[PDB]
Design an enzyme around this catalytic site. Structure first.
Site, PDB file in Angstrom:
ATOM      1  N   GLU A   8       0.934  -1.295   0.020  1.00 45.96           N
ATOM      2  CA  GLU A   8      -0.017  -0.114  -0.005  1.00 45.96           C
ATOM      3  C   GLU A   8       0.813   1.234  -0.049  1.00 45.96           C
ATOM      4  O   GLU A   8       0.606   2.140  -0.839  1.00 45.96           O
ATOM      5  CB  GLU A   8      -0.934  -0.147   1.200  1.00 45.96           C
ATOM      6  CG  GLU A   8      -2.180  -1.043   1.044  1.00 45.96           C
ATOM      7  CD  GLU A   8      -3.033  -0.628   0.080  1.00 45.96           C
ATOM      8  OE1 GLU A   8      -3.029   0.365  -0.533  1.00 45.96           O
ATOM      9  OE2 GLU A   8      -4.035  -1.471  -0.158  1.00 45.96           O
ATOM     10  N   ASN A  16      -7.585   9.479  -5.571  1.00 46.98           N
ATOM     11  CA  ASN A  16      -8.478   8.461  -6.645  1.00 46.98           C
ATOM     12  C   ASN A  16      -9.154   9.411  -7.390  1.00 46.98           C
ATOM     13  O   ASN A  16      -9.362  10.622  -7.194  1.00 46.98           O
ATOM     14  CB  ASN A  16      -9.481   7.552  -5.719  1.00 46.98           C
ATOM     15  CG  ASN A  16      -8.322   6.836  -4.704  1.00 46.98           C
ATOM     16  OD1 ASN A  16      -8.439   6.818  -3.644  1.00 46.98           O
ATOM     17  ND2 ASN A  16      -7.368   5.978  -5.429  1.00 46.98           N
ATOM     18  N   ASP A  58     -12.328   9.399  -8.168  1.00 47.22           N
ATOM     19  CA  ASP A  58     -13.452   9.854  -7.499  1.00 47.22           C
ATOM     20  C   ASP A  58     -13.438  11.108  -6.713  1.00 47.22           C
ATOM     21  O   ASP A  58     -14.492  11.382  -6.173  1.00 47.22           O
ATOM     22  CB  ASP A  58     -14.243   8.641  -7.105  1.00 47.22           C
ATOM     23  CG  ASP A  58     -13.298   8.308  -5.630  1.00 47.22           C
ATOM     24  OD1 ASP A  58     -12.257   8.862  -5.372  1.00 47.22           O
ATOM     25  OD2 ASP A  58     -13.775   7.460  -5.163  1.00 47.22           O
ATOM     26  N   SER A 109     -11.817  11.057  -3.792  1.00 49.09           N
ATOM     27  CA  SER A 109     -11.243  10.616  -2.462  1.00 49.09           C
ATOM     28  C   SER A 109      -9.696  10.654  -2.700  1.00 49.09           C
ATOM     29  O   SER A 109      -9.056  10.388  -3.549  1.00 49.09           O
ATOM     30  CB  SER A 109     -11.718   9.332  -2.227  1.00 49.09           C
ATOM     31  OG  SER A 109     -11.543   8.271  -2.961  1.00 49.09           O
ATOM     32  N   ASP A 120      -6.546   8.352  -0.489  1.00 48.32           N
ATOM     33  CA  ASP A 120      -5.758   7.434   0.557  1.00 48.32           C
ATOM     34  C   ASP A 120      -4.701   7.987   1.289  1.00 48.32           C
ATOM     35  O   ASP A 120      -3.844   8.680   0.771  1.00 48.32           O
ATOM     36  CB  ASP A 120      -5.628   6.098  -0.136  1.00 48.32           C
ATOM     37  CG  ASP A 120      -6.554   5.616  -1.070  1.00 48.32           C
ATOM     38  OD1 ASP A 120      -7.545   5.565  -0.569  1.00 48.32           O
ATOM     39  OD2 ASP A 120      -6.157   5.099  -2.256  1.00 48.32           O
ATOM     40  N   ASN A 133      -9.099   5.550   3.133  1.00 49.70           N
ATOM     41  CA  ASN A 133      -9.622   6.173   2.251  1.00 49.70           C
ATOM     42  C   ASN A 133     -10.547   7.245   2.709  1.00 49.70           C
ATOM     43  O   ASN A 133     -11.306   6.811   3.843  1.00 49.70           O
ATOM     44  CB  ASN A 133     -10.273   5.161   1.283  1.00 49.70           C
ATOM     45  CG  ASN A 133     -11.159   6.002   0.076  1.00 49.70           C
ATOM     46  OD1 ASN A 133     -12.387   6.347   0.249  1.00 49.70           O
ATOM     47  ND2 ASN A 133     -10.448   6.400  -0.968  1.00 49.70           N
ATOM     48  N   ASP A 139     -15.512  -4.648   9.710  1.00 46.01           N
ATOM     49  CA  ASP A 139     -16.701  -4.149   8.775  1.00 46.01           C
ATOM     50  C   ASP A 139     -16.854  -5.212   7.529  1.00 46.01           C
ATOM     51  O   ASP A 139     -17.708  -4.731   6.759  1.00 46.01           O
ATOM     52  CB  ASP A 139     -16.313  -2.934   7.981  1.00 46.01           C
ATOM     53  CG  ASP A 139     -17.546  -2.125   7.412  1.00 46.01           C
ATOM     54  OD1 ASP A 139     -18.353  -1.744   8.136  1.00 46.01           O
ATOM     55  OD2 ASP A 139     -17.586  -1.761   6.164  1.00 46.01           O
TER      56      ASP A 139
HETATM   57 RH   LIG Z   1     -19.955  -0.911   5.016  1.00 48.21          RH
HETATM   58 RH   LIG Z   2     -21.104  -2.325   5.989  1.00 50.02          RH
END
Ligand SMILES: [Rh+]
Ligand SMILES: [Rh+]
Ligand code: NA
Ligand SMILES: [Rh+]
Ligand SMILES: [Rh+]
Ligand SMILES: [Rh+]
Ligand SMILES: [Rh+]
Ligand SMILES: [Rh+]
Length: 129
Positions: free
Chosen positions: A35, A46, A48, A50, A52, A59, A101
């Site tokens: 990374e 990025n 879009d 965003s 990192d 992000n 997550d």
């Molecule tokens: Rh999520």
């Molecule tokens: Rh989620």
């Protein structure tokens, strides 16, 4: 700061990353290598809008506030800039929330594409713990 392999394994161990949600320490070093090449100050814009941030390239769309990511959340309640510090506390703790997550370490593309399946033990070899 540009950490060395063993310097980084040590700090990630200290902050409780070894087998957090079942991911051995070597996974985490391997992810940081591909990374950030172990650079805490690494940022990657990025397509879009965003960005990192830091050694685990966290992000801005979801996890931190950089003030210029349209319609984004701050799920780790931190300014992205804190993720760029030579102390990896904010990155390590934000990582704990990300890995929890549901995708686990699949959230890191470099981990999925270059660490998953491989001998990630190579990364913590010759390091005192
Ligand atoms: Rh999520
Ligand atoms: Rh989620
Ligand atoms: Na955000
Ligand atoms: Rh903790
Ligand atoms: Rh290298
Ligand atoms: Rh530390
Ligand atoms: Rh922690
Ligand atoms: Rh130990």
């Amino acid at each position: 700061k540009v950490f060395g392999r063993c310097e980084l394994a040590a700090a990630m161990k200290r902050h409780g990353l070894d087998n957090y949600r079942g991911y051995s320490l070597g996974n985490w070093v391997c992810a940081a290598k591909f990374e950030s090449n172990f650079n805490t100050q690494a940022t990657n814009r990025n397509t879009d809008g965003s960005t990192d941030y830091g050694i685990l390239q966290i992000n801005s769309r979801w996890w931190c506030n950089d003030g210029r990511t349209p319609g984004s959340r701050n799920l780790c309640n931190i300014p992205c800039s804190a993720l760029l510090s030579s102390d990896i506390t904010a990155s390590v703790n934000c990582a704990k929330k990300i890995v929890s997550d549901g995708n686990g370490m699949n959230a890191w593309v470099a981990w999925r594409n270059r660490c998953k399946g491989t001998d990630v033990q190579a990364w913590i070899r010759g390091c005192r713990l």
